[PDB]
């Protein structure tokens, strides 16, 4: 169909590879494609080169290498294995005295590998390492909150590499240094560095009053050795001042590159701020036996010059995106690798003393368990390592571009104020000001801008076109925030004739400040409006007509769309829906030109120009992390000629390479009998009829048969006391057959467990005697279907012990996984939403005949209540509906770019073209206007919508151009008394469905210590009656209902047993008893040596334990 | 010290704290019996005091004792009693309860002010014991055990148990609650009307007192059991019996939204 795009802005450059923030980071970290001799000192290479040599025998690092994966990705996901590569390291043990060299390549374990899309596979589960924003290392100067005319100089290294240092001018005049919460005069540390009163008097003497406070006569009297011993006594009291120990401590604190690491970014920032050059990444050096200053004197000089008011010295904005940097997958994984390597080195140094001092190999010296443990920890249990969100392709693509301010080495939730959560002026083009979680995490979790990319130093850069004179070049310069603050940057929509600026006055930014400026003052220009917002925010048409708070929800809810079996791309697109399907690997494309050899449901075979015959296997009905099905459908035909980059198969939630998160439905905006009251939504049963909003969901069930001290658990079809009807769909081995429908209560895997030794109650003795049947040795423990679940069994996997290729965890005989799929139709309680933040639950599904319908008989699909529009201020959906009406009748879709889109007059033109089809067809078919259309036209010209006196057709066109049509009530046939906006809207079925959320419990599992019910739907738990619900009950004055909540309905064992029996017998419920949790409190207070006594009115002890704990 | 599903073991931190105490105490007894010098005995007694402190209130003085290979402080008795997760606030002033459910809420315009729409299966599990008794009174099941075994499988559910459940819930009310419960009207009693589907149906007029809407809210259901609890719910907590706000006195259930627009 025709696709008409709007907008005059030409993007000189396309979007960067959207997953490159993950891909390039990890690639640079591992350097597996670089021959070991040509590796730079970064990443894993830097970690090894930093850890080695291990000096104590001397063990040295030569090189490393990464092997091939022992198993492919699909195998890893199948068998709960980690996708990883073996890491080998060549080390040579040198005896410095003997000269002996014993060289060996030792195996250090496996390192996890990133897949094509930028994710990882940990224990069969897909995970994403989320980038972490933090303060860039360096030297900052911030106003002292106490004294207004004084300042604090902060020296900040990389996380977990060295302490923070605070330089402060005390009120008494002496300059102080604060390290590890201890403070002392900076003069002492200067004296250890070799400074003398002469050098300080000449270097800092330009500022009169401060240097005199710096001077301390007793410090200059003593030589650097005595000052070193004195400083060691000040920093470590109780430790005898051994000079070797003092050198060791001060060196490891300041000058040791192994224990103190400024960033490479931190080094550059210190060099750029202080105007100096660093020989390394430390604050000082140990050279020729003494200490040589690097950083301290320039920072002190800058502090003094800032205090005096010397021009050219500024305080630092610590939320400036030039002072805040991103630590991506590579950096965090490298940190944990470095930790594991340092522990391995401690183990080596410990091994270099014990055993025989002569016969040692690198294989005998190295223990890789610390390194394996550290990497396993980082990938498995970290906060920044998250279970991948792959609901739809956009979910994961956006997940990988997430930026967290939380995690280890970062903020907690209480530590974050307004300054961190704020939108900084430097987020322009780097961090999206819209897309952020709604809740307590607002401003902490954010997302990367579209054209933004993080450079090698960790700062986010945004592109700008160079403007020389009045001519806009096509060359793009990627700037950090600090460099951006230098130029005057015009807006991307400024008028252009050719490459020349066509406006007399242009809108530009100087340090984010908006300003009107002449084209000669224009140094750079925006690339596109797209660069200001995230990827999801760029998928919202007419975004300039939506308030930000609702655009936030539109973005965040596109992440939650469920891939539908008939999903289609919106009628009004933004222009990014194809590239999104491209960069996340949902759809399958052709590598080179060629001709299609074969097309199946399972594979596509292409014969390229090379002559080679390539086969692409298609992923069909695979369960994602969240249960939404991943499956690729072939979009080509046998013998079709394809080019390079042409589509081969559509992925999940895509239509012909366009991102298809929902469906295009015909919507009418009007109240309807209160069924759309307060954001509820009314839908047509025609949606269920043609299988719109029907989605496939697969759930995985699992069961283990293991060895017990009471006998083996066996997976068998033989189950005690079960009818053939109950075992009907089970095969010989006890597992359900593929293709059989399972309902709640049905058996998936039968299993028998040996009963625990129990002396039968005399009742069971007499009962067994009556019926004459012996008690079975085993017990039914079969895996059944949980309440509210079920579907068709599509797969079974059985793994035994002793069969080739498989080994389980100790004690486990066999493991069976059953996969159950279901086709979910739309239903009452399922949540819909559009891209503009309009969301709501389906409250009524009407038969087609009740649905409001156009005069030509066409019923609408969805009825949205207009009351949600004015308060929410998201008009974009209205324009989407207008353009969608036009496109519904013209039979065409559109591309309206963000902030440069289809404007109202063009929409009116398309609406008129549509009205010709809508009405001239009727007039040619031999039909005039309806009486009720005349009544509606009367009431409409009473509203001032149409001009009085024009013909009925002319007035209907005047209404159509406002996007309003005559609408008939299907129940009466009488029209709606006014003209109503009807048009095509893009609506998505969100992941939140009633089938997943409905839950009830009468009685069930109780917790161990408190004996209260469990929580969660999966555990068949109870609802929590919190403090505030108890307040509600008290304020109502309902004492007995409250006592029920406290005793009978939970945590009172005698009470709840008696209550259940009374109810099943028809008797009224008994008086409650003492809550078991109060007994727990009494005993736990006795454990704290506090005597708690429940007394009666005579102050006599009352026993609530009923003599059981009293001797 | 318990065995989990997979045959593994799970234990409380008090066990490791008590083990530390017992070890240091026994070693002190042995060091005293062997007449060790005063430096050694002093160190041992200091470690014993540290262990008693870590048992009673860990982290209170000095570094918190942690399990090997973990930065997580062990959970002492003081940590058990005090805090948002403490015994008082988590298990004493508030409890998880039986005969409760939760589901997504939907607008119920056809309802009367005193009513709410309750899914069938929710009411089947919530009223399960009453339903068993009623299925025993009618001829549907020989006894309670057969009736429960009949409800256990969803395909074994015939159409007489639904009419029996209708007989069961007649006249009784359930509590609807929506978090957060800011004032006493965050919980209200409604006569339930059994509905197909899985959504709770909420009357429009009570949306204001709950601060509820249908952008995806969910509500919890509770069943008052005794005749006393039912009397309290029907007389005091019924939605149609609370029309005015206790804070101001002005009407709380009032025409609003679509209603005001039409009028």
């Amino acid at each position: 169909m025709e696709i008409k795009r709007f907008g005059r802005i030409r993007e000189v450059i396309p979007l960067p590879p959207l997953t490159e923030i993950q891909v390039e980071s990890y690639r640079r970290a591992l350097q597996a494609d670089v021959p070991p001799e040509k590796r730079e000192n970064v990443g894993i290479q830097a970690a090894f080169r930093e850890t080695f040599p291990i000096e104590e025998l001397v063990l040295d690092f030569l090189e490393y290498r990464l092997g091939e994966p022992p198993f492919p990705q699909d195998e890893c996901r199948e068998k709960d294995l980690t996708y990883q590569a073996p890491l080998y390291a060549r080390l040579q043990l040198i005896h410095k005295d003997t000269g002996l060299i014993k060289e060996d390549e030792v195996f250090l374990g496996h390192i996890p590998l990133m897949t094509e899309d930028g994710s990882f596979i940990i224990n069969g589960a897909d995970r994403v390492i989320v980038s972490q924003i933090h303060r860039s290392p360096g030297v900052y100067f911030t106003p002292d909150p106490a004294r207004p005319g004084r300042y604090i100089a902060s020296i900040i290294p990389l996380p977990k590499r060295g302490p923070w240092i605070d330089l402060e001018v005390e009120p008494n005049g002496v300059v102080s240094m604060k390290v590890n919460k201890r403070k002392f005069p900076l003069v002492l540390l200067l004296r250890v560095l070799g400074y003398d009163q002469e050098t300080l008097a000449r270097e800092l003497g330009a500022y009169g009053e401060l240097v005199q406070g710096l001077m301390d006569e007793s410090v200059f009297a003593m030589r650097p050795e005595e000052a070193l011993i004195r400083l060691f006594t000040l920093l470590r009291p109780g430790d005898p001042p051994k000079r070797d120990k003092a050198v060791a401590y001060v060196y490891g604190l300041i000058a040791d590159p192994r224990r103190y690491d400024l960033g490479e970014a931190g080094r550059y920032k210190a060099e750029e701020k202080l105007g100096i050059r660093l020989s390394g990444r430390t604050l000082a050096r140990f050279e020729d036996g003494e200490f040589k200053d690097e950083v301290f004197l320039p920072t002190l000089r800058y502090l003094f010059a800032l205090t005096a008011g010397v021009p050219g010295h500024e305080v630092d904005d610590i939320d400036h995106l030039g002072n805040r940097r991103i630590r991506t997958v590579g950096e965090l994984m490298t940190d944990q690798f470095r930790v594991g390597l340092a522990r391995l080195a401690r183990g080596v140094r410990e091994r270099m003393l014990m055993g025989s001092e002569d016969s040692l190999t690198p294989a005998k010296l190295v223990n890789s368990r610390p390194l394996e443990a550290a990497i396993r920890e980082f990938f498995s249990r970290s906060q920044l390592s998250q279970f991948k969100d792959e609901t739809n392709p956009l979910s994961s693509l956006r997940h990988k571009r997430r930026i967290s301010a939380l995690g280890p080495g970062g903020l907690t939730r209480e530590r974050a104020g307004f300054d961190v959560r704020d939108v900084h002026r430097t987020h322009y083009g780097r961090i999206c000001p819209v897309e952020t979680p709604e809740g307590a995490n607002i401003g902490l979790i954010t997302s990367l801008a579209a054209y933004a990319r993080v450079d090698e130093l960790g700062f986010i850069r945004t592109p700008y076109r160079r403007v020389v004179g009045g001519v806009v070049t096509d060359e793009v310069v990627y700037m950090t925030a600090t460099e951006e603050d230098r130029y005057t940057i015009a807006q991307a929509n400024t008028p252009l004739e050719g490459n020349r600026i066509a406006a007399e006055r242009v809108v530009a930014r100087r340090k984010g400040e908006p300003v009107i400026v002449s084209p000669e003052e224009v140094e750079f220009m925006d690339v596109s409006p797209k660069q200001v917002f995230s990827v999801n925010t760029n998928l919202i048409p007419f975004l300039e007509h939506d308030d930000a708070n609702r655009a936030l929800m539109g973005s965040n809810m596109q992440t939650q769309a469920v891939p539908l079996i008939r999903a289609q791309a919106p009628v009004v697109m933004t222009g990014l829906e194809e590239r999104v399907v491209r960069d996340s690997l949902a759809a399958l494309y052709a590598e080179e030109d060629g001709e299609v050899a074969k097309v199946d449901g399972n594979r596509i075979v292409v014969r390229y120009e090379d002559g080679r015959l390539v086969e692409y296997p298609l992923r069909r009905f695979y369960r994602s992390n969240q249960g939404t099905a991943l499956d690729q459908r072939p979009r080509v035909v046998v013998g079709q000629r394809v080019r390079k980059g042409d589509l081969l198969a559509d992925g999940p939630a895509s239509e012909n390479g366009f991102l298809a998160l929902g469906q295009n439905v015909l919507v009418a905006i009007m109240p309807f009998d209160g069924y759309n009251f307060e954001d509820a939504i009314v839908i047509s049963e025609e949606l269920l009829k043609r299988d719109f909003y029907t989605s496939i969901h697969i759930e995985r069930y699992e069961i283990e048969a293991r060895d017990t001290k009471l006998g083996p658990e066996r997976i068998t079809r033989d189950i005690p006391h079960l009818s053939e009807a109950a075992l009907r769909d089970l095969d010989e081995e006890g597992v359900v057959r593929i293709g059989a429908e399972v309902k709640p209560g049905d058996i998936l895997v039968g299993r028998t467990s040996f009963k625990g030794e129990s002396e039968p109650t005399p009742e069971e003795r007499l009962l067994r005697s009556i019926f004459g049947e012996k008690a079975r040795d085993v017990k039914d423990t079969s895996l059944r279907v949980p309440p509210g679940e079920g579907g068709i069994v599509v797969r079974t996997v059985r793994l035994r012990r002793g069969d080739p290729g498989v080994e389980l965890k100790p004690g486990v005989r066999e493991v069976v996984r059953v996969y159950v799929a279901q086709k979910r139709k739309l239903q009452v309680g399922d949540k819909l939403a559009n891209r503009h933040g309009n969301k709501g639950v389906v409250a009524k599904i009407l038969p087609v005949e009740d649905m409001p319908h156009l005069p030509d008989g066409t019923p609408v699909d969805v009825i949205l209540n207009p009351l949600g529009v004015p308060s929410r201020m998201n008009l974009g959906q209205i324009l989407e509906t207008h353009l969608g009406l036009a496109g519904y009748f013209l039979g065409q879709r559109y591309i309206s770019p963000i902030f440069d889109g289809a404007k109202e007059p063009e929409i009116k033109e398309l609406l008129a073209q549509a009205f010709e089809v809508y009405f001239g067809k009727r007039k040619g078919e031999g039909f005039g206007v309806d009486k009720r259309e005349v009544e509606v036209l009367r009431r409409a010209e009473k509203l001032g919508l149409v001009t009085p006196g024009k013909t009925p057709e002319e007035q209907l066109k005047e209404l159509f151009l406002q996007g309003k049509v005559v609408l008939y009530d299907g129940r009466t046939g009488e029209p709606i008394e006014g003209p109503i906006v009807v048009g095509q809207m893009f609506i998505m079925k969100l992941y939140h469905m009633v089938e997943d959320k409905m839950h009830a419990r009468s009685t069930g599992p109780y917790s161990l210590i408190t004996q209260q019910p469990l929580g969660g739907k999966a555990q068949f738990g109870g609802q929590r009656f919190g403090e505030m619900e108890v307040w509600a009950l008290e304020a109502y004055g309902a004492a007995h209902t409250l006592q029920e909540m406290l005793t009978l309905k939970s945590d009172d064992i005698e009470g709840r047993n008696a209550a259940y029996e009374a109810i099943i017998k028809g008797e009224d419920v008994p008086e409650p008893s003492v809550p078991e949790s109060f007994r727990v409190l009494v005993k736990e207070l006795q454990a704290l040596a506090l005597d708690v006594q429940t007394l009666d009115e005579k102050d006599n002890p009352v026993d609530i334990f009923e003599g059981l704990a009293s001797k | 010290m318990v065995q989990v599903d997979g045959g593994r073991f799970a234990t409380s931190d008090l066990n490791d704290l008590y083990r530390r105490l017992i070890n240091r105490n026994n070693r002190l007894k042995k060091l005293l019996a062997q007449g060790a010098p005063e430096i050694i005995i002093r160190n041992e007694k200091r470690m014993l005091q540290e262990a008693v402190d870590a048992l009673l209130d860990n982290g209170r003085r000095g570094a918190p004792v942690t399990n090997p290979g973990s930065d997580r402080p062990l959970r002492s008795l003081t940590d058990i009693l005090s805090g948002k997760q403490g015994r008082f606030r988590q298990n004493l002033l508030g409890k998880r309860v039986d005969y409760s459910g939760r589901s997504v809420i939907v607008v119920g315009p056809q309802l009367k002010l005193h009513q709410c729409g309750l899914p069938k299966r929710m009411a089947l599990e919530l009223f399960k014991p009453f339903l068993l008794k009623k299925m025993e009174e009618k001829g549907i099941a020989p006894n309670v055990k057969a009736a429960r075994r009949m409800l256990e499988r969803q395909r074994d559910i015939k159409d007489e148990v639904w009419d029996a459940l209708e007989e069961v819930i007649h006249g009784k009310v359930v509590l609807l609650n929506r978090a957060p419960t800011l004032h006493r009207l965050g919980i209200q009693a409604f006569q339930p009307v059994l509905v197909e589907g899985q959504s709770i149906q909420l009357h429009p007029l009570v949306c204001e007192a709950f601060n509820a809407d249908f952008d995806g809210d969910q509500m919890a259901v509770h069943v008052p059991l005794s005749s006393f609890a039912q009397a309290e719910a029907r007389i005091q907590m019924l939605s149609a019996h609370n029309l005015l706000s206790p804070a101001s006195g002005e009407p709380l259930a009032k025409p609003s939204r679509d209603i005001i627009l039409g009028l």
């Binding site: 109780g238 430790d239 005898p240 | 430096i39 002093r42 160190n43 200091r46 000095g62």
Partner: peptide, 14 residues
């Protein structure tokens, strides 16, 4: 405040 440091100091007195 630190038991190891205090015990080492007690040790260094003999």
């Amino acid at each position: 405040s630190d038991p190891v440091r205090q015990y080492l100091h007690e040790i260094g007195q003999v």
